[PDB]
Amino acid sequence: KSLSAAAQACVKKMRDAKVNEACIRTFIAQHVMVSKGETGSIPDSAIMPVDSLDALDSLTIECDNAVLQSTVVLKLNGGLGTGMGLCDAKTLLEVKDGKTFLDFTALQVQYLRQHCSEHLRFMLMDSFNTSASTKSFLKARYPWLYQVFDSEVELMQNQVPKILQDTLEPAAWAENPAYEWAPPGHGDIYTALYGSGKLQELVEQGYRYMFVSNGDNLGATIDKRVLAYMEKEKIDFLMEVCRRTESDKKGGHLARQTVYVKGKDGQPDAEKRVLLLRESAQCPKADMESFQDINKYSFFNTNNLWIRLPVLLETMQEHGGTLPLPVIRNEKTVDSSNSASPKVYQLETAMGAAIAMFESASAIVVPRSRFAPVKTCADLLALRSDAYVVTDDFRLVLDDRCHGHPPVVDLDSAHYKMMNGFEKLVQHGVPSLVECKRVTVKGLVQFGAGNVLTGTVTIENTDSASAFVIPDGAKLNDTTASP
Ligand SMILES: O=c1ccn([C@H]2C[C@H](O)[C@@H](COP(=O)(O)CP(=O)(O)OP(=O)(O)O)O2)c(=O)[nH]1
């Protein structure tokens, strides 16, 4: 009511689409913020760095199994993994030995149900793109999960209209009606859990803790030392972070901020703390130096989050059924391929940003073994290789002969960024990267079946007339090999 015609059009639009009401309430709130000209900037003058945290390696103590019976595991399955040029679900790529990401997860859940807590709950966050494939995979590979897939496993992600930069109205593309919508970031999970009523369901069913992570990350597995830690320190929201390195200067960082509880009564000294998240887009042009200074801001979000659900539900109800979160303003056109299509805004939230929205919240430093996404085919190769190994609880860990360090793989992105070409590289077989510090492939190359490599291994093809084919059983140590 009393909303600008622009907003009113969006409501009307989403109504006809039969869009969940929790999404419309949330999105309009976000639409208003933008319309009022909220910059969304997070300057250094508004924040202080975080310098000390508990480490996961230091905790020894495991929780009892009764805890795990009220735990929910939720993976994010929205991504298409187009970065490797794949038009279906990313989690469905083979990782090791005919097993996909979705395989290792399902097998890990299986372990916990049998050997620890049978009441453990598994859920998935699917986009419209990933829903069918995910269901079809489970129907063949994991019946029990499929059986309930529709009923309590699958949580569908919402879609939100792209608004015109020019009038903030819902964009209209007659060529492709589907391009009028966009996913609202992975922070939509909260809005999805509320409107679907599945938050209310779980809590009523006596489910307290939930662990959320990215599907493409095989580092993220349940660790009972984290659950015990939360119970002991009464934490409602725990964000796993790894250390920010030279490579991570582009990535966002964990920071802290101050508000005050009402009144100045008590000892007039002690302050408050809130933990927030700052993406690069939120940082102003002037503060970009410190932002990339990893000695000041030393931690980044691994997106492995443990949440206390009843508290989470309570919090949303205080704010009228939604969870306010900082809104990234995505500047695009309605059809990304068309440069001359109408310029639009896409409003997106991050799931890690909610940390600042909880009274009892914290951040724990985990080893980078717990942050292992496969963004590229180079990363995909490492896992196929014998450098890694599958455990009896179905974890993926680095073989002991690597002595803690995983083989760096450089692939020529002209040929190998695409999974298509990449498969041709490994077509005849797979090499042994366990003893290989660094491997590099330039130009067009195809591997022999059973080869092995040690130390620095460079493979260069400048000719690029056909492909340099490695002999079977060939061995390369601290060398470059061209034809
Ligand atoms: O909105 C989301 C975003 C991510 N993911 C999952 C899938 C991802 O593995 C992960 C984070 O992906 P991102 O950094 O967001 C990248 P991007 O989603 O642009 O990727 P593709 O273009 O789809 O390939 O969480 C979701 O389930 N929902």
Q: Which atom of ligand 1 is nearest to the CA of 125?
A: 27
Report the nearest-CA residue for atom 25 of ligand 1: 214
- Residue 375 phi, psi (nearest 5): -90, -30
The binding-site residues of ligand 1, defined as CB within 6 angstroms of any ligand atom, are 76-83, 90, 125, 157, 183, 185-186, 214-216
Q: Which atom of ligand 1 is nearest to the CA of 215?
A: 9
Helix (H, G, I), strand (E, B) or coil at 404: coil
| CATH 3.90.550.10 domain position(s) in the chain | 1-374
Alpha helices in 288-367 (DSSP H): 288-291, 309-318
* Residue corresponding to tokens 């703390």: 273
Torsion of Cα atoms, 346 then 350 then 351 then 355, to 10°: -140
Report the nearest-CA residue for atom 12 of ligand 1: 79
Q: For residues 212 and 155, give the distance between their C-alpha atoms in angstroms, rounded to a whole number.
A: 13
CB of 101 closer than 8 Å to CB of 149: no
How determined?
Answer: X-ray
Q: How far is the CA of 225 from the centre of ligand 1 (A)?
A: 28
> Does 110 appear as a known binding residue?
no
Helix (H, G, I), strand (E, B) or coil at 374: coil
> Does 216 appear as a known binding residue?
yes
Give the chain's largest Cα–Cα span.
79
Q: For residues 281 and 268, give the distance between their C-alpha atoms in angstroms, rounded to a whole number.
A: 36
Q: 1-374: which CATH number, 3.90.550.10, 3.40.50.150, 3.40.50.300, 3.40.50.80?
A: 3.90.550.10
Q: Which atom of ligand 1 is nearest to the CA of 373?
A: 9
Q: Which atom of ligand 1 is nearest to the CA of 83?
A: 24
Which residues are tagged catalytic? 375
CA dist list (Å): 76 to 150, 391, 464? 16, 23, 40
Asked whether the CA dihedral 180, 186, 188, 189 is positive or negative, the reply is: positive
Q: How far is the CA of 28 from the centre of ligand 1 (A)?
A: 23
Asked whether the CA dihedral 365, 368, 369, 370 is positive or negative, the reply is: positive
Give the pair of three-digit tokens for residue 389. 């190994």
CB of 443 closer than 8 Å to CB of 423: no
> Does 98 appear as a known binding residue?
no
| CATH code that applies to domain 375-483 | 2.160.10.10
- DSSP secondary structure letters along 68-135: HTTEEEEEE-----GGGT-SS-GGGSEEETTEEHHHHHHHHHHHHHHHT-TT-EEEEEE-HHHHHHHH
CA dist list (Å): 106 to 62, 125, 138? 22, 14, 9
> Does 343 appear as a known binding residue?
no
Report the nearest-CA residue for atom 23 of ligand 1: 79
Q: For residues 308 and 417, give the distance between their C-alpha atoms in angstroms, rounded to a whole number.
A: 39
- String of b and e for 197-225 (b: at least 16 CB within 10 Å)? ebbeebbeeebbbbbbbbbbbbbbbbbbe
Q: Which atom of ligand 1 is nearest to the CA of 126?
A: 27
Ligand 1: which of 214, 279, 302, 351 to mutate, judged by most atoms within 8 Å of the beta carbon?
214
> Does 263 appear as a known binding residue?
no
Q: How far is the CA of 248 from the centre of ligand 1 (A)?
A: 18
- DSSP secondary structure letters along 181-238: EE---TTHHHHHHHHTSHHHHHHHTT--EEEEEETTBSS----HHHHHHHHHHT-SEE
- String of b and e for 296-316 (b: at least 16 CB within 10 Å)? bbbbbbbbbbbbbbbbbbebb
Q: How far is the CA of 404 from the centre of ligand 1 (A)?
A: 28
| CATH 2.160.10.10 domain position(s) in the chain | 375-483
- Residue 370 phi, psi (nearest 5): -90, -5
Q: How far is the CA of 313 from the centre of ligand 1 (A)?
A: 25
CB of 399 closer than 8 Å to CB of 389: yes
Give the pair of three-digit tokens for residue 285. 């042009």
Report the nearest-CA residue for atom 24 of ligand 1: 81
The reported resolution of this PDB entry, expressed in Å, is: 3.0
Torsion of Cα atoms, 161 then 374 then 364 then 366, to 10°: 180
Report the nearest-CA residue for atom 13 of ligand 1: 79
Q: How far is the CA of 78 from the centre of ligand 1 (A)?
A: 6
Could you tell me how many residues make up the chain? 483
Ligand 1: which of 102, 129, 156, 186 to mutate, judged by most atoms within 8 Å of the beta carbon?
186
